[PDB]
């Protein structure tokens, strides 16, 4: 397991390449494998320790990438759960609020979406144009 901490950045990079090329399903598989590596390393660490936390933080963007792939393939249940897990630890994560909001909006949880999009707005005001758009689209279906 430990020898594969070196593999993670390369897997991460290949997943990104696949994603941007439009191979979203294959990208998700790459992200999943990268996260699995980090989780295996994290299991050897005590929860709440510096090393556990560092790995947890290396997992976050990969897990959000994975969630982004799930949004594209219209699978919302895992996005909601993974974003919620991230946000229950790191409640300032803008990307997690945004993706969870997208997923809430896509499953007709209009109120939970608005709440998440408000948090995006609160934490990164530069995203106001996008949030306004998401909000306008929610209101349109009201």
């Amino acid at each position: 397991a430990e020898e594969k901490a070196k593999a993670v950045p390369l897997i991460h990079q290949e997943g990104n390449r696949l994603y941007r090329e439009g191979h979203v399903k294959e990208a998700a598989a790459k992200y999943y494998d990268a996260i699995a590596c980090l989780k295996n390393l994290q299991m050897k660490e005590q929860p709440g320790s510096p090393e556990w936390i560092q790995l947890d933080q290396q997992i976050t963007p990969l897990l959000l990438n994975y969630c982004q792939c799930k949004l594209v393939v219209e699978e919302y249940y895992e996005v909601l759960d993974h974003c919620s897990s991230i946000l229950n630890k790191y409640d300032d994560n803008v990307k997690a609020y945004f993706k969870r909001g997208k997923a809430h909006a896509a499953v007709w949880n209009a109120q939970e979406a608005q709440a998440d999009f408000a948090k995006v707005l609160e934490l990164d005001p530069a995203l106001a144009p996008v949030v306004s758009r998401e909000l306008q689209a929610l209101e349109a279906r009201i």
Binding site: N16, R20, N65, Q68, L71, K95
Partner: peptide
Amino acid sequence: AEDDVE
């Protein structure tokens, strides 16, 4: 972008 990957 918010629909890109990190």
